[PDB]
């Protein structure tokens, strides 16, 4: 626009929180669907829902991770990554059922002399593969659900051989997208790329997606966020460059059904 408006410069405001960016590459709305509340014609639990509105639909910033030449990739699950985030987490553990959409904003700036590219993928039902070749489907709840720290990808499959006390964790191999399918095809999932010469962030607006209108947020993750270095970090001639990656995520249109006492999960 002749009054300055740009595809690269955005402001997002949800609740008492604002994000600004001056180097965006537009933003994505997954499958073209904006988040919505559950409609009466698709409703299922009959009790009055709880809708925390601004108390939970606001931007929460997770722990910042670090991108280096040796980084193979990072992953998070939703709602799991937000389980300890203010009143969203509270509302989640007090109710049997919950549904929510999200604005996911991945942040990573550098300089005109750095280079590298992160593929940021939002995957519905991001089932990841386990570490065992003696057993299948055995990743424990605790290891499946890292909370805000997320997990990481590896370039090597390495099977857990301790049969006495199995690790029971995922072993998500990067070129296999951690699930036995080729990473080059992950672009059919809603995504953006942070290519440092072009942009310093990715913004994905995710609808609630599920085979049900509402479900157990504590038992089930609807979305997975996978971030992988499509082109590796590089800077000047430094052998060991580093730049930070920060995730800020906001729940949108979340509602909860089936209120009782709070869930106290076994997380370790």
């Amino acid at each position: 626009e002749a009054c300055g408006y740009s595809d690269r410069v955005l402001q997002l405001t949800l609740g008492n929180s604002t994000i600004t960016t001056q180097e965006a590459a537009n933003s994505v709305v997954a499958y073209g669907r904006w988040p919505e509340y559950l409609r009466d014609s698709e409703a299922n639990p009959v009790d009055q829902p709880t809708e925390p509105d601004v108390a939970a639909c606001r931007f929460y910033t997770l722990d910042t991770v670090s991108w280096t030449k040796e980084s193979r990739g990072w992953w998070w699950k939703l709602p799991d990554a937000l389980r300890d985030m203010g009143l969203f987490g509270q509302n989640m553990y007090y109710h049997y059922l919950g549904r929510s959409g999200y604005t996911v904003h991945v942040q990573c700036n550098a300089s005109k002399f750095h280079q590298g590219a992160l593929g940021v993928f939002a995957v519905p039902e991001m089932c990841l593969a386990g570490d065992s070749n003696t057993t299948t489907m055995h990743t424990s709840y605790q290891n499946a659900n890292p909370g805000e720290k997320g997990g990481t990808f590896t370039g090597t499959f390495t099977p857990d051989n301790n049969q006495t006390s199995p690790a029971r964790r995922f072993c998500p191999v990067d070129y296999l997208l951690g699930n036995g399918t080729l990473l080059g095809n992950a672009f059919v999932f809603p995504h953006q790329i942070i290519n440092l010469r072009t942009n310093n962030c990715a913004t994905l607006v995710l609808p609630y997606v599920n085979s049900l209108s509402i479900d157990s947020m504590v038992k089930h993750n609807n979305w997975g966020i996978a971030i992988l270095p499509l082109a590796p970090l590089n800077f000047a001639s430094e052998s060991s460059p580093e730049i930070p990656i920060t995730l800020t995520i906001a729940p949108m249109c979340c509602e909860f059904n089936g209120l009782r006492n709070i869930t106290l999960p076994r997380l370790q």
Binding site: S6, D7, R8, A25, N26, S27, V28, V29, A30, Y31, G32, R33, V188, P190, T198, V205
Partner: protein, 60 residues
């Protein structure tokens, strides 16, 4: 209760038609009509918030 539809005639020897009658109460018992619709790829190929004009710079 007969349903009359047209065939898309491939190799040739007016519209040629074919007839269909459902014999059962349950729609699950029915054959597939193959009278299906198409849609635009956009929700997967252009999932961006601001409409893309292909002659224009994608980044502006």
């Amino acid at each position: 209760g007969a349903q009359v539809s047209s065939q898309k005639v491939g190799a040739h020897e007016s519209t040629i038609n074919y007839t269909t009658i459902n014999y059962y109460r349950d729609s699950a018992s029915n054959a597939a009509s193959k009278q299906d619709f198409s849609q635009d790829p956009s929700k997967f190929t252009e999932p961006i918030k601001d409409v893309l004009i292909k002659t224009a710079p994608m980044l502006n």
